[PDB]
Design a protein around this ligand. Structure first.
Ligand SMILES: [Fe+3]
Ligand SMILES: [Fe+3]
Ligand SMILES: [Fe+3]
Ligand SMILES: [Fe+3]
Ligand SMILES: [Fe+3]
Ligand SMILES: [Fe+3]
Lengths: 148, 157, 152, 153, 152, 152, 148, 152, 152, 152, 152, 149
């Protein structure tokens, strides 16, 4: 099935882009974060970035194992992707809100992959589900700090 | 609130770190992304060894990007390596899709050679100004020099 | 055991039993390929085969223990496994390209049984279906690692 | 930054995974009771197997509960609540290893009924929470076999 | 089983049984606080609460096995634990300060039972008394790690 | 180019080849017993069989690699292994005592090939002899751990 | 003050001999045990032996650190010690009863040490108490098997 | 002598000796801050200080042993260390913000000495200079980890 | 602190504070002996002193934390530790016999403070006494490991 | 037994029994020397004696389990071991030179039984011979590490 | 040091000394090959050579320590090794097929010495013979991993 | 792309590869043949000097190759370029130490020339020589402190 492979690339490719973007912009947030929660938030952002890289890898290799290429060069990723992470120094609350905003957009792509792969490829569906479990948990670890 | 003591403060020294280490952060972080690209898309008779070597190049580039970034931040200056900025400052020969292992190694040596030029500029440019930052540039150059050899040794014949 | 509706257990045994057989066969024919492989890619491929064999052993265990957990026996004695299974791995020394092609061929027939399990367990037992999806994920990846070597 | 992102999915998780948390967390406490009080010819093997069923159950409780909380709804698993929502066949004092296994298997059978119900209820609603129920069911099914296999003769 | 100064066994049961119920309740109620905690200190307190629960589970096991090893049973079923124990941990989401104050409250009540075990075992069984001491040193330290956060 | 006794290697391959078939069959038939074992000693015997299987796989690997190191191929495909090998392990569920007797029976047959290799290799290749001696030391030990269970 | 060191030697020396003897006699039971429970009991006896060796060390090193020699040559140890462990093959139930009987006699010496050291050296009494905790738990793990 | 160059050795003692004292005093005063710290960031700051202390101990060792390797003694007795150093760390309980400022002040004093060492050793002994540069990289990072909390 | 006994906190501070000063001083002076030791046993004694310093550091921590857990602060600033403590460890290079003698001397003065804590906490707080017993067991053993070298 | 042979098992017991006794005795006598050793090489000899003890315990276990795997009991009760064995290790404190000489003397007596086993098993059971050779190889190395200290 | 029989020690030196010289040279020449290897298989062969080197270093050590344990010296100074040993490893960069051919030639020469040691120790000292047997197993296996690459 | 930089670096680091790789071999020699009252400690410390020396050899040789130049470190070249004071047979630990310290002293001469001469050529290769020199100076001290007596 050329269509099973076509459908994974269509649904999983946005996932590789946003997860690979989260690695880079996540490291930006980790470097520049300031303020009274520094060390916890600096470490937490490092763990989200490690997760993001593992997820980009799982999704990318699921596409490639099906026999289709992935274009995830820097130029392409920057084209398909954007970020609320500030350019410079920012308070820990602001870094959190910026990363949650990047995570929310990745969640919309994970859910679209989950619904889109239901009637086509349960194995590729399972990859988006496993990623969404981890990203939902990261989103909570981050956002619970602002709950009040 | 600016790192390094003895004299005050010094805005000069921080400003040189940012100037020479910033292109390093951007090229090393680009090499993480483009190296993963090469890692996913590589094909042909040397697949598993080159697939694995590229992962280890990426893991090094990521460490180097962090050490350079944190050295800039420790001196009290921000760093801009958002995806958008990094894309503007950086370019790759890694192909868009599948490619034979020889071609991937050439594309990645080309991107490493661009980083080397910026490391050698940092080493020269920091020599008169901040030996501690210079050491960061030196340490990353040794690792990058070795990764380059591991890549290039495959093409000797 | 139990009033634990007997048709769920029977569907796992029917769809996962071929996975146990072909995965356990892959352990043995993979060791064969690992011992007897030759040529310019020897070390990497000898290593990669050992890793496919380790995966195949784990997948066989996982599928078999799912059947037995649901209360049914499994026959994968050597004699049953040999009746139910066949291999393209050569008898003796062979070049790495040839070993890879033979292993990918065995992997391709296991993938057939994995997808039949996935499709067949969908309206019956989602827990057992997840065992097959998990194995299929790993097998698809092992197949790409092997097959990428022949890509030109 | 909303915190609960889909109230509907959140509610479905709370509805179907809350009994899973209660029974797994109760299984930690009553599994320990069986581990402490077990006697007879199979002591050391069963004492150790019960410890591993307890460690699983603690992880399953944690995974289930954090799935509900991540989605934005709280969980009440205080001791008083857990005790009102749960019961156990584990004996109050010393018991032979066969009776401990029967009692622990009866507790796991009631959790499998709640896991299957979660699997069924999450199917049209949230496949990501369904996957959490499916992962737990696989491990609990395995533990049930390990225990029950001792009684097969 | 087989000895057995019923006396020393009785003292252990009298004094360590409340320690088992309170430590085992702290595992359950500490997990409740770990799940539901919110606020600017979330990650550190979520993690510290896990570490308290891990300690409390080891202390319950040590105190319970000390009683059983001496030859008396322990009734630590959920229904009995719920009858013997009470918690201030809230039913839902709560700010990290409130979770700390609730958990320090539950720890303060265990400390009263730990001190009564240490005094009560003193003339009776120094080996059971050492169990109560070892537990109290860890609980005292956990109480400080929690309470230090509120010192201002 | 350059030396060696192809005679030595051929004689040695013929002594070790039976070892490889029986060891590799014991992996498959041991897993079979591991999955299907039942009764009052389940968890201990299930675990011990897993360790018997891991040793057998190491032994098959050590013997096969010895043969290949000497320059000779080895045919351990499933089809060949089934022709040369048989098992007393039952087709389905079996009481632990019977699983131990069946596995000991398979071990006993392997020990006949091992002893023949140790005796015959004494005059052929002391290096290959040492492989058989090491495999036999472990197998003699697994047999006692299994069998000591029926001593009463 | 010689009196502290003399009390330690006096009370801890029997503990060294009996723990050291339990290493040897427990190895004897570990090698020769037979029966339905072989593997569990074979492994449990190894674990008793490892504890016994650790305890004999800790007690001996306490005596020596206080300045006094210890004589636990084989010959001394055997004049001072006896065993119920059978000379050959024995069912697992009989090995357990013989090892528990050797443990019971070590318990009598441990309790005498705890009582004897109470008014004299609390630091050496802590050694006896820590060993008794461990031995009481080993005793239960053995005997629980015959509870029936 | 025990030399080498008398001059080179002397330069290293001269420039690295202050570095040994300030690092070794930071162990001691960092532990102080670690024990006595309070307030809403307690756990994270309590852990952070322990890691600064573990680094300062390592830096003290590295610098001292560089001096001794070159054949010169080092006097880092408590009494000497106390004459040659001073601390802003409070005597008792303090809020985490104040411990951070006290520690960063002790660190800025040490950075002054590290920089004079890097400047003074440039012409004389580049091996010892590298010791000071390695330490200064670590200490600069430790300073940032602390001071970042007050940027607020 | 707590809702109860001021005498418990005060006795712990009274008896364990000297122990913190002496153990923390032994970290500093032990490192001095470690760096400056010479002669035929260099490497064995260099290593042993590092292990003595690691223990002293852990003991200093355990005793300080016990005090703070009970609600009282501790002043182990360098300045204070210097006022309350002395050393026989020499200023520069010394033979290993004289480093062992100096370290033993510092350890004997610690043991006097530990035995005074043991005796003084006996009627006040058995949990705090247990801390002092545990440190004394370890320090007594370090003392023997060192002094046994001079039994020559 | 197997379908195999009783005069093999009898040989093993005959040649390996005195090994089990002497190695197990070296455990106890080795501990005795490790406790009581004094003088300028204390820590290095203390630690060396512990490693010899650890090897001796493993060697006893390997010899004993070989005998038992063959189907024969082993009597290594304290009383039997004490009967079959003697030591030159002193009752009390002794200089490290004397402890080395006493231990090497116990080792030489074991080497005599190890050599008789190697010669005696040569025509009877090459598998048990291999156990004797493996033990002798370790014992020969331990002896060298001890004796090298007295060479001058 | 010492030993029993001067003849045993003398045969060990005579037959194992050449093994020590060849293994030790293969560490040095193996490293040369590992530094200078080029071509399509660089990383696999670079890593494979490093593991051949690590094995050779261990075999050198084992053989040399066996000689010394029996009481005789070994002269393995660089000048001696160089007089006793030669290599076909090239001086400079070389393709991986050519590094493999050179290393395999150096191993072939060591295998001649090993087989001479095994034959020559057979009537003299089964313990030292077992050392040459174990080395020869490992080296025959390294030889295969190298040469398999050239089968095509 | 300056070939003279790499060649100059190779020329400074090559004697370091030879002397370090010889110390591996002659250190093993001392580690096997050492006797006397401090046997176990010195036998062990010599094994750690050897493990360091092998690392230093590797790091220096691989910097040369990374620069694109071959290194000739065959046994025959190493023996032509190197000498040792380690005795041929059994020797007391004090004599093994003096011989090894003498080999180290000759290596420090080469490390110091590399450090001085790489200062104007290649700071990255200089840094390799400084790192090896820091480790070797520590091993020198660990050995020699036993004779300070
Ligand atoms: Fe569906
Ligand atoms: Fe337990
Ligand atoms: Fe023979
Ligand atoms: Fe008292
Ligand atoms: Fe032989
Ligand atoms: Fe300069």
């Amino acid at each position: 099935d050329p269509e099973v492979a076509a459908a994974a690339a269509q649904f999983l490719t946005p996932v590789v882009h946003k997860m690979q973007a989260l690695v880079v912009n996540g490291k930006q947030a980790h470097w520049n974060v300031r303020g009274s929660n520094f060390i916890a938030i600096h470490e937490l952002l490092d763990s989200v970035v490690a997760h993001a890289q593992d997820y980009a890898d799982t999704a990318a290799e699921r596409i490639v194992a099906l026999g289709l290429p992935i274009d995830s060069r820097v130029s392409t990723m920057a084209e398909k992707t954007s970020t609320a992470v500030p350019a410079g120094f920012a308070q820990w609350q602001d870094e959190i809100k910026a990363i949650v905003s990047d995570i929310d957009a990745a969640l919309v792509d994970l859910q679209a992959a989950i619904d889109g792969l239901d009637e086509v490829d349960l194995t590729s569906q399972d990859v988006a589900i496993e990623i969404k479990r981890g990203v939902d948990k990261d989103r909570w670890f981050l956002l619970a700090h602002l709950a009040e």
